[model samples]
Target: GYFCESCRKIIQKLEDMVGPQPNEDTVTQAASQVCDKLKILRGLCKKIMRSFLRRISWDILTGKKPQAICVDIKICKE
Candidate 1:
């Protein structure tokens, strides 16, 4: 529902923060920056951060859509 949209929105924001030509370090950096401002569920999502980190890193590198990425994480299936 509303939560899924926000997932896509925030993932898009991370994509923006990442810009073009992102590496492992860049993904880490962008996630941290996005997390700082985006809340990222405070302590709640830190685990999902662990869960999503590798997926988010790989997916964005391959230019996967943020919408698709959220679904892959299963936080938003549609």
Candidate 2:
């Protein structure tokens, strides 16, 4: 039970990172290949012990994790 709560907490953070309203635009904004990312992001979620594991452990081609993981576009209003 503790594990599940911990997992939920982590998942919530990830959800916060992804945000609540993950519509097509949100997915596209976060990643270029939205379709592909969405497939893996949600599909492989079960394998993770907690979303924290996924958040802490990430592999990216880019050297910087922050840069690697971020919304591709800046939605700024003028």
Candidate 3:
């Protein structure tokens, strides 16, 4: 119950920031991908924890250093 709420809170915050978009652009696409990545991490919370996932989510969600997130995702894709 608590864990689910926490996850929803984080997702909700991201959605609030991104809002509705007509189509995906570079920033939106990147945001969506980060959200997707975070979801995957959340699904693994059985082994990890929501707190750790939340921290990671915040790190990549926005701010000055998103390339760190992009680089990590790019490497994962390769």
TM-scores of the models, in the order given? 0.76, 0.28, 0.29
Ranking by lDDT: 1, 3, 2
| Candidate 2 accuracy as lDDT | 0.34
Clashes of 2: 0
Taking the tens digit of each residue's C-alpha lDDT, what string does model 3 give over 10-76?
4444445655442234334444453555664545332222334444445434442333433443312
> Tens-digit lDDT track for model 2 on 1-78?
233433343334444455444544443334333223445344333344233232333322122233223322111111
Off by over 4 Å in 2: 23-78
Backbone collision count in every prediction?
0, 0, 0
Best by TM-score: 1
Candidates' C-alpha lDDT: 0.71, 0.34, 0.41
Clashes of 1: 0
**Candidate that would win on lDDT:** 1
Quality of model 1 by C-alpha lDDT: 0.71
The 10 consecutive residues of candidate 2 with the worst lDDT sum are: 69-78
- Per-model RMSD to reference: 2.4, 14.2, 11.6
For 1-78, candidate 1 gives per-residue lDDT tens digits of: 555776676678778888887898788767755766677454433444566787778877888886777777677865
* Candidate 1 regions with alpha-carbon error over 4 angstroms: 39-47
